[PDB]
Amino acid sequence: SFLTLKDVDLKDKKVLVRVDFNVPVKDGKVTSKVRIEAAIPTIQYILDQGGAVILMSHLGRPTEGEYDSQFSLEPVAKALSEIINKPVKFAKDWLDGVDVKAGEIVMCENVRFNSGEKKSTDDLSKKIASLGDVFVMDAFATAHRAQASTYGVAKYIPVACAGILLTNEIQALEKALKSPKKPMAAIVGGSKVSTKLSVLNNLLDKVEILIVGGGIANTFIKAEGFDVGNSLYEQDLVAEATEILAKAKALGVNIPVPVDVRVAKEFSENAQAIIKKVSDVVADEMILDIGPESQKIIAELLKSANTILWNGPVGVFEFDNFAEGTKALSLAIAQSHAFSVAGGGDTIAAIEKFGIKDQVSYISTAGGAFLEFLEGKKLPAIEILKEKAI
Question: Are residues 180 and 133 in the same domain?
């Protein structure tokens, strides 16, 4: 395992916390408070245990060795101060030491400004580590990248553990991917198979039901030999999709390839959907959504599931005439008592549109980290936390 805040000594300790404070900024004011409000339980626990909080985060895309004001975390410090109702000192030159007492909060300048952050150089990692006694990794969105303030600091700090947010995230993802309650259904939607091929390969031997969506499903329809016309699909990944369908068949995994679809003759919000059987798609037409019979099959399957992993829609739900497939998917997940884990920008946009946020067990706000976890890849920041637990 890895250590958590509940099993480390924090009383009269300089505690370095790596948070996700990559918040949007406009006219020297932050425009979102969600990421700041999310870190509050971790900070309050450290403060109540009698420690000193040293906050660390990245903000935007700056160049290492180039301090740029538009990338500074000073508006984030000011926002947190107004939220937690406690003073937050901003340390511009943090690496040269941080003067903090127990019960105080100090916000470091953006890490990505320092040389060696992305590479996780021993020199910078040793310097960050010398600033404190405890390191708390609470930024899951950067766990898939080995950086000095995510990975290196853990190597040299006396004690390294995981914050309340990273704990909850890893607990939820592992409850879906490592130890699920069968049957388990995974939904993998997206534009290309190539982009989610490592995900599909990793889920195939873990899931009972594998639902494919969007451009991914269209390549599977062509793999099943039906003409997809002018739909979005990968002709070069058709042979790979056929192999995935054969592996699934042998494994006893259900891939409910659409039996019916909703086509269009123009890719727009003004286009009208035409319900066709999967075998009746014309050279002119575009599959933009699944059809009503496919909707009911997915609903009935998701009804039986005890674990649901959701990564993508089954259609172009942004267009109301092609939103019925994803709406029915969303409502089936919402009505389910299964432990449901959702992740992906499009997935979250679907949850928001269909208003089922409070009916999804856990919603991941991470992009690349959620996907790399789903690929079965070992995230460097979680791994170093496990090595430090031994």
Answer: no
CATH number for the domain harbouring residue 75: 3.40.50.1260
How is residue 254 annotated by DSSP? B
Binding-site positions for ATP read: 196, 318, 344-347
**Which residues carry out catalysis?**
35, 192, 345, 368
Task: Tell me the technique behind this structure.
Answer: X-ray
Binding site, by residue number, is 20-22, 35, 58-61, 112, 145, 196, 318, 344-347
Can you say whether the dihedral through the CA atoms of 190, 193, 197, 201 is positive or negative?
positive
Look at phi and psi of residue 203 and say left if phi exceeds 0, alpha if psi is from -120 to 50, else beta. Answer: alpha
Residue 369: closest CA among 140, 178, 126, 210: 140
Residues 360 and 385 in one domain: no
Annotated binding site for substrate: 20-22, 35, 58-61, 112, 145
CA–CA gap between residue 314 and residue 294 (Å, rounded): 10
Report H helices in the chain: 34-48, 74-84, 122-130, 153-156, 164-177, 197-203, 215-223, 238-251, 292-304, 324-335, 345-354, 368-374, 380-387
Q: Domain range for residue 308?
A: 164-377
Asked if 318 and 350 touch (Cβ cutoff 8 Å), the reply is: no
| Residue 389: CB atoms within 10 Å | 14
Are the C-beta atoms of residues 313 and 346 closer than 8 Å to each other?
Answer: yes
Q: What is the token pair recorded at 33?
A: 């408070």
- Tell me the structure's resolution in angstroms, rounded to a single decimal: 2.7
